[PDB]
Amino acid sequence: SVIKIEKALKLDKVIFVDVRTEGEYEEDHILNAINMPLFKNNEHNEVGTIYKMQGKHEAIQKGFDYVSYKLKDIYLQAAELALNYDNIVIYCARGGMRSGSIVNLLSSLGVNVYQLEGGYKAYRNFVLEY
């Protein structure tokens, strides 16, 4: 269910899906990744602030407010990728709840997906490894 970047980059017929905002994906993303953003740029900032000021419980609620309607499309996009790629690796900034929730849900619906351990940060550290 979780995979390390060193192994993910070696998978046959692999596609990386970045669930960060369009803002973050545009700045830098994993080579050949597609963007399936969970949050719009503004939604992301509000969820982050809520998390800081109120905690996780309230941040999750706000997340549902912004993503519950997007979830069928996420399934449909993943189901389509699955016709074309043998391996689907989902990643967020640091490998927490954004990618974890999507991966767990998709997997319970029978779509074979993995979460990238450590998110985009793990990829950056892999590329820049001395």
Q: Copy the structure tokens of residue 26.
A: 């545009």
**Cβ–Cβ < 8 Å for 33, 19:** no
User: What is the dihedral sign for C-alpha 80, 17, 19, 40?
Assistant: negative
Calpha distance 99→30 (Å, rounded) = 15
Burial 60-85 (b: 16+ CB within 10 A, else e): eebbeebbeeeeeebeeebeebbeeb
Full DSSP string of 44-60: HHHHHHHHHHH-HHHHH
Cα 94 to Cα 35, 74, 101, 130: the distances in Å are: 16, 20, 13, 20
**92 belongs to the catalytic site:** yes
Calpha distance 52→122 (Å, rounded) = 23
**Cβ–Cβ < 8 Å for 102, 111:** no
Q: How was this structure determined?
A: X-ray
User: What domains can be seen in the chain, in order of their start residue?
Assistant: 1-130 (3.40.250.10)
Q: Which residue has the tokens 């597609």?
A: 34
Q: Which contiguous run of DSSP H or E holds residue 61?
A: helix 56-67
Catalytic option among 5, 74, 92, 103:
92
Calpha distance 63→129 (Å, rounded) = 34
